[PDB]
């Protein structure tokens, strides 16, 4: 339950499936709303209950309010710390593009990983989490582009 | 449905990491359910 990146798993009567990823920071677990839909999370022996969420931002926090507040500088390369199902964590560096919306520009990464990678953290060069991966769009040729989704602290 | 978490690593930047992906500039809309879509 210490700081770090975690897989979000589900199991019924047989094996387990990875449905997402999240970040533990300052005693709060951060992931994307579509990963858990607000369901409680087991962490070893304990139960983590959702504390805050927002379906439109596609974010959820457990144990306390959203803690991640680093922002993409709009200029520099970033790293996705991808935690794909069945694979160990790995870093991919990229220069974001931009989702241009009526309410402003959002950094966006043209990186394509399985659905259960949703919630993987995107990092600045200091290792701070500037957002989570996995809410995005496909373009005409089918390629996937994810927003750099960050909440408010 | 037992949903549970398991630690997967430390959060750090990797020096000399592999670089991939383009930098698309896309016009998009965000609906109230959290879905992004391309503006036609």
């Amino acid at each position: 339950t210490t700081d770090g990146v975690y897989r979000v798993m589900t199991r019924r009567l047989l094996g387990s499936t990875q449905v997402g990823v999240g970040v533990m920071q300052e005693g709060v677990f951060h992931t994307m709303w579509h990963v858990t839909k607000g369901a409680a999370l087991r962490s070893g022996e304990g139960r983590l209950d959702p504390y805050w969420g927002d379906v439109k931002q596609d974010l959820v926090s457990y144990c306390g309010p959203w803690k991640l507040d680093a922002a993409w500088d709009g200029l520099s390369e970033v790293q996705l710390l991808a935690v794909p199902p069945g694979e160990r964590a790995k870093n991919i560096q990229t220069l974001p593009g931009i989702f241009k919306t009526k309410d402003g520009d959002i950094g966006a990464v043209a990186l394509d990983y399985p659905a259960g990678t949703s919630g993987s953290p995107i990092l600045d060069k200091c290792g701070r989490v500037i957002g989570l991966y996995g809410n995005g769009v496909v373009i005409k040729n089918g390629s996937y582009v994810s927003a750099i989704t960050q909440g408010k602290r | 449905v037992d949903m549970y978490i398991e630690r997967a690593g430390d959060i750090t930047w990797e020096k000399d990491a592999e670089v991939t992906g383009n930098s698309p500039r896309l016009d998009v809309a965000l609906d109230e359910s959290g879905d992004f879509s391309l503006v036609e």
């Binding site: 394509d112 399985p114 659905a115 949703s118 809410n135 995005g136 769009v137 496909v138 | 992004f36």
Partner: peptide
């Protein structure tokens, strides 16, 4: 996206 958005 393995799916088209998430």
């Amino acid at each position: 996206k393995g799916x088209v958005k998430k």
